Amino acid sequence: LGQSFPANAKVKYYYKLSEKQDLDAFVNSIFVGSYKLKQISYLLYGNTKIVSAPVVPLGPNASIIIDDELQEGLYLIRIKVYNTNSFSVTVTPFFNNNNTMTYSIGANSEFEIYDIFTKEQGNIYYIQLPPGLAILEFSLERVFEKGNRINIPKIIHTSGNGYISFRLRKGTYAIKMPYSYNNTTSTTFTNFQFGTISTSATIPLVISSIPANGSGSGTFLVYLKITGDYEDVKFSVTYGGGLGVPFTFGLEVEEINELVENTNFVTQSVTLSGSQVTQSILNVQGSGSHLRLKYASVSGLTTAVTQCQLQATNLNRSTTYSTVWDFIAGGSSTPPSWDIREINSIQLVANGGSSTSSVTITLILVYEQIAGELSHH
Amino acid sequence: LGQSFPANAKVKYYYKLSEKQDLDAFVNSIFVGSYKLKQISYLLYGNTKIVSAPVVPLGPNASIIIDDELQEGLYLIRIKVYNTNSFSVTVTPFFNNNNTMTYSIGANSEFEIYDIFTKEQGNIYYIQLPPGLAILEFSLERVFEKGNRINIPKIIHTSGNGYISFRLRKGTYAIKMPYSYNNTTSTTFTNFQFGTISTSATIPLVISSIPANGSGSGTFLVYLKITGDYEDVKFSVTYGGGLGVPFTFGLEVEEINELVENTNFVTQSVTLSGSQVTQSILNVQGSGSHLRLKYASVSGLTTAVTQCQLQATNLNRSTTYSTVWDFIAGGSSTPPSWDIREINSIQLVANGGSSTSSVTITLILVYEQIAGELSHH
Amino acid sequence: LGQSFPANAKVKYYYKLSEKQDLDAFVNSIFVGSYKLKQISYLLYGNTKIVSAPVVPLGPNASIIIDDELQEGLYLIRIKVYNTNSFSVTVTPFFNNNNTMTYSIGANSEFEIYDIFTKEQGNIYYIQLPPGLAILEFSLERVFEKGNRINIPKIIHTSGNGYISFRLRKGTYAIKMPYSYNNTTSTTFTNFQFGTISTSATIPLVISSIPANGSGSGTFLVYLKITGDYEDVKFSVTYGGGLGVPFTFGLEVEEINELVENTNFVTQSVTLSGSQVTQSILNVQGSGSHLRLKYASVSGLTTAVTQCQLQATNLNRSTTYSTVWDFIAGGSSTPPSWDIREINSIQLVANGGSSTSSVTITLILVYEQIAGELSHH
């Protein structure tokens, strides 16, 4: 199955394979297998574009393999191809660690293969190309330069497994995945987990309900705050290869400015009767967002209350909550300079009252919910 | 109507078609149709510039078509042409989504065709060029690099329909459209909607009045805050093709720094007599702006008032208002750290008093109005 | 007076005209007229530099004219020339809109012609060069790239009119103009307006006094805050062509970080006797600066005072003042979160007292004066 290939020539970041000098370099550097040069024609707004391009001949798949020392960074790869066959063919994009998800390329048509490649730690780009595909252009470009984003249309097919990985430098990002599915089973799912997005922090991609035998479409939209100390992002399809619910999805990854999703004044009562109570106020871990606390106050405090502490943490960093305000020691409301950032869970720990005489206290809290899942540390 | 064309050569980002090597590449990549090479002369400050350039011959329009894998981004296209005809000709710029708006190119004159092209998702650039146009230069440049802006002069003609789309990366932008119109009808129009600017959020472009049989000019100026999760912007002319009010307009799109349009101390009374009241305080949705709340206070509170909550939202994200301060639970005025950002609508919800004994409360509010329509989420 | 010229060749951003290939391109693209190639010598630190360069021959002026689709942006142009004449020659730089201000180039000397050119909306660069000038180098570079500034030495001559325009992207800029003048009149000028700097907002450049028959020097230094929605800046000399006060000046335009010019606690009393009073507190419109209010308080309020509102505005945006604090409705002092930005004029509107019993109130205000004239909106 393996073949030998000559690889002496310097790699280019762009090839138009209908140019002789680009083709000559391509097949002495990153192309594996043989090719036949053919005249290729396809329609553009009713006009017929005609080029001579290399076509993969009958036999084993060809490959493109790049181990050269490209400039490090995250590349969007675009391969312009034309399927000369009268039947569909499939391609399995690299996506750094995919080997199951596919593109379906229709008979007698031009098609854009999108791929993603992180050049770090000697990573080697690899993709196989089936017989009858003409290769017209091959493009390597770094994304997140000059304000570009990853924007892959809804063409990625999965049947329950697959991976896409990419490195993100510091910043906050939106990851958007338009999808369509076709449920072929008689099973009704509720809270169907399609997949997860994670750094070393995990965000589940969940659909409220997928009706039996139904088809539908929607969009996943989540946000990651990349502090910068954990840059490798991993998307995994988790619902399981044999389920019978094929999805087709797109992938958009783009830098955003701060997004305050909402700001809220909230109130929570706690009744104390002799025992310590730990009351969750808010937990947005795994949601694609985090919190910022601006103000807190507790009413109903009496000498019968022995403990009343507001605690918070970044659960992706630590499961141990730290006290951010002590209403007994510090007073019934937070001072003007009090501002709690980079947390995603808040609880109130209180104690007091008796088994015969309970005390009810009321916490009020003003907080912002801000886009971006917090990373591990 | 369709023609075949050879497209083997690598596309360039700049062509001067009076250079042989540029012309040769141009007509083996992106130019459809035949040309005649002619000596072209035109005036610059009284001097006669003379070049040899390709001219579209009598017959079908020529086209420029680009499906090549250009670096992704938003391009400003400039085509320098010279109309060799003794009559005006028209061109229909691509603008990503336009096929009705035109440029009018005068007889025997040089002209700059401006176009806009978003290279994402395999988008294909397309423009037709009529017989007698000489094509002198063709330029592709990314805007919003190096602090550039889109700046098209007042030369775009519409008679009631048309579209222009473009991708904007994160940032706040001004969109300015200088216009002139001629109302050839005997009808005077009020709150005339010329068009809309939208992302997935909508801003109407409205003219207070257009006098019957009148002609006039003005400038639309609106702002978009692109968080970055919705980047595709769409301008639509909506007044209707057969109306009889031709407009000529320009388009300037440029990044801005934060613009505080004004800061205001405002007061609002509400009379309560037993029933819940929901009182709108401010709603700037669709205005090209948003709000920031700095301080609020309510006077006149008594035990007769059972509810008094200030609520706010980004209506482009959610029609459900969230409470941002509760004057009963939290006290009659907001604390120093209270600061409500990224909203565009505010209301007061209150209840109390009786059918026989009403209570009047007064809200005071300090807020900023900030340039930039908020996007959907 | 007009001549024809061949313009087939691609324009370059740098030419050294003593190189044959640069000269060949230059005279087949942007140079109008004939030249004579001559050996040119001039002194550098006592050494004689020798080059062969094109010289404008006896006859009509030559021109440089550039209408090609250069990358858009603001260019600083430098032309290195050598005056082979035994007499002075003058050149009139383009400066986008100038046709009266001049450089005076001494006999038998090297000289740097600085020019400014905004490549937007098909703008065409144009400058004439008199006989006997050798053209050594021609340089086009974008400024405000890589932290560069416009820095033209004190060599620009005006006798009372002239214009320089340039586009500035978003940011705050200093505009500095070192000048010398010779008053050839016996008139003592008081508050002599030399010129103005404006966007669509105007800053007068004023000298306190110019003594009769006097000669002097100084520096204008003003600042513009370019929000980004109005980028075209225009400098105009306004004192009048026949006045008899020639100036020579330089031009430095450079981006700055925020500059707090001063912060002040100020007090203002107002006496009320039955009628509404509108008292100006501060107005810095047209000064090259704006204001930020941090704190305000009014003492002396009694039930005899019926109105006491602090109002502010950006006069370049609106002549209608908005209330920023109401001391009656809101209380005698501003809250911690009160912060009024982007204004340049403040007034107090008050009413109360009677014709027989006046009331005196005292406003205190803390504000910053910040560099940068606010733009129109």
Next chain:
Amino acid sequence: LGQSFPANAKVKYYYKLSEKQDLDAFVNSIFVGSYKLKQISYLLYGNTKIVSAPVVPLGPNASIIIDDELQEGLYLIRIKVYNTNSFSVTVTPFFNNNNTMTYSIGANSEFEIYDIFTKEQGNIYYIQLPPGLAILEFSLERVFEKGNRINIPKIIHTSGNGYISFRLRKGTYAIKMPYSYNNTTSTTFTNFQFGTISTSATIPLVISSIPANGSGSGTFLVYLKITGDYEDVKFSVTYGGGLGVPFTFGLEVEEINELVENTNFVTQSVTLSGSQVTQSILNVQGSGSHLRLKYASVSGLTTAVTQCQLQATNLNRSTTYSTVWDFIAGGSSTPPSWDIREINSIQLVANGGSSTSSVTITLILVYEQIAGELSHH
């Protein structure tokens, strides 16, 4: 041991040595010694890549030495090699200051040599290459351009000494070092110091425990705030060459945005009985973090307390603490604007009470702990 070498040719930032013109330049500039050109084959995804590349022949090691005036900055070097020997060979990377730590390159295999080189003050790059190594590619790239990071996999071998140095421009950085160790001794270690990271400020890299005869893996993760006045960072392995605990580690250096590790409300009592007490509250010097104080308050103050001052400092800058709040002179709690940044140690100095009548005061403090060791000044 030393050899002469020709070095006339300009240095390149990238060489692919299977290209004749790159090899020719390489061996007339930076390569020392002889080479034999050989056909080299190795496996990539089951395919056989074949190139002709220079191999170090039997005899003395070859060297690469670069003293040329490269653009200044910090370079990541990658050398793609292939070990043609049937035995392992070792290489000692430059790392600016290393001459003991090694890579181990397996028999008959391709390997990526990573190195680091700071081009400042005439620094000269140097690495030796043993016989039988084929050199395929040599890459010099600046890191921290375009959001790149240093990311070297876990392949660096130390047995108790070694240095790596690099220059960081202003910013905050994470330094992450995944490691594995093998303790060959019967000795049990506690608070094992592997090494230190320092600027002119020192951060110990410590392992809680290394069990006797144990092997283990973990990750060091520390942060440096580079103000910019001290840019040269030095990593030192300190545990001692003969210890018998070999480590293998990786190195990741990347820029981060502000990281609030946690925010805490803390309380501390101090009992006074006639003598001055200096009570440490918090000291995070050498931890890879610093502090920011937001609010402080002291309860229990009476006329019996004569001194109560909160003091802070950046210990890397100064061992003398400065008073940041005086609870006697200033009052029992800090004002809204009180905010103490860029410190890493806090203490309370207090005095009062008597030998017969003690007074207990309680300090409460709200502070953030922020990633980044503070530098010296």
Next chain:
Amino acid sequence: LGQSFPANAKVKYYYKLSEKQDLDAFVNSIFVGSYKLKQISYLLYGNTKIVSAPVVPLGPNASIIIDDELQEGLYLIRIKVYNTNSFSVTVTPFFNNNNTMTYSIGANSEFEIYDIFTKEQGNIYYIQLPPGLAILEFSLERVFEKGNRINIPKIIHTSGNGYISFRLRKGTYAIKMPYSYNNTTSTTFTNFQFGTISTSATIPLVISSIPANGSGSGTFLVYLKITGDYEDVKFSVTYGGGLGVPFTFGLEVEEINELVENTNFVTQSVTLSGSQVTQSILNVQGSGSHLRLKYASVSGLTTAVTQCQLQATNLNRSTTYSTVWDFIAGGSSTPPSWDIREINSIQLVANGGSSTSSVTITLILVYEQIAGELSHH
């Protein structure tokens, strides 16, 4: 002493003079004088690098002179040379304004000449090279691009005069100068001023004491806040040419992020007895730093105090202090929003009490000292 030189060829930003085409350009553009091509050898890690390079022959010094229109900006020049003489030679770097300070280049050794060149306003680079120096490479690179800094090692010799000038764009910068001195005199110095750093603002570089006949070393480290309106920085050695205290020093200029040097709570009493008192609180003008005031309070105010104003200024901008808080008119302590930036001198002006009954008031102040001398305006 002056020579003629041919200068037709375009200037390059990098020359390796052992390449024929680089040398050919070099000696037809910027090199003045004759050269002899010689085989040059020197040691690098025990290996002998051999190149053929131009050597200045016996006779007058050669010169490098550059008046060409290089891209504007601040350049670091590196000249790699080799002294073929068996005696030391000296070179005088340009440094924009130097003509006394020298490098000493040892016999038979390679050496890096560092120089600084501001390309603005037609500035011409100039340096003389003595007989016997081989010139191997010549490099022109803009600093402050890509996060580079000026970093010249301790090799600049002065005996009491000399200048270095450079342009800095907006930012805050550290200027670090490691130095060594030899006092050949038995004079012991106190507060020895070595030199000054200034913009149009001045910072003295002072050494506490220089013992008689002593030698020593140390480092000057000061900071400049470049707002951007004054960008030209001048370093002057001022101690005087004949003093007999030679220094050798290096120069490091690098951009920094905000540096809070310290934050302090300070107290100051003032006794009033009928006369106005102006009490200096803090003055850091000329120190390389500035202040920011966060909070102020005065205790001891009575009706016997008629004036109590805190005043501040940027003395580099204005010698007139402005009132920043009036404790009589405004109250005994500053409000939460009070924050005074960009000042470097604070005083309290007070009046009250009588010749027979004095009043003592106490000011408390919290302020930050921040790196960066403020510039003139």
